[PDB]
Write a protein that binds this DNA or RNA. Structure first.
Length: 105
DNA sequence: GGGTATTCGCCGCGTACCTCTCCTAGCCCGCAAGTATCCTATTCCTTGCAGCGGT
């Protein structure tokens, strides 16, 4: 793909066991430089993201034994239109129940 | 007045480490050093006044 998001109509028809000629290598070079610059900027930003996050939740500390309530949320497997992207057994593994479940009996 | 749009200005943008260099400008006044000049001698000549033999 060329810099501005377009896809070149002529692909690179040469692997690395054989040799890339000049132009093919040029295009690959552009792609690699885009990747490198993106990693640099992306990590720079992610650092700021995490620093913001840890400074809004730093004061929270589990500090009791049981609040004694009954409200929860309905955990269900996630569906996107297609298959199950995440089953139920991996979304409630290790979270206490709110209202005892009744089997489908 | 009043609800709205548009503009202006402030706030923010990763961690840790290693190597190197450079850090005010300009005036001014004492002051050391180096020098050209001015007064200091010697040798020649021609005057002006005080002693002084001589009679």
């Amino acid at each position: 793909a060329k810099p501005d998001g377009s896809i070149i109509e002529t692909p690179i028809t040469a692997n690395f066991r054989e040799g890339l000629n000049v132009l093919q290598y040029f295009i690959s070079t552009h792609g690699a430089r885009k990747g490198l610059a993106d990693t640099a900027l992306k990590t720079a930003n992610s650092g700021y993201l995490t620093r913001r996050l840890v400074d809004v939740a730093q004061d929270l500390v589990v500090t009791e034994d049981d609040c004694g309530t009954h409200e929860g949320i309905m955990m269900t497997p996630v569906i996107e239109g297609g298959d199950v992207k995440e089953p139920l057994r991996d979304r409630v593994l290790g979270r206490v129940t709110a209202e005892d479940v009744l089997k489908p009996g």
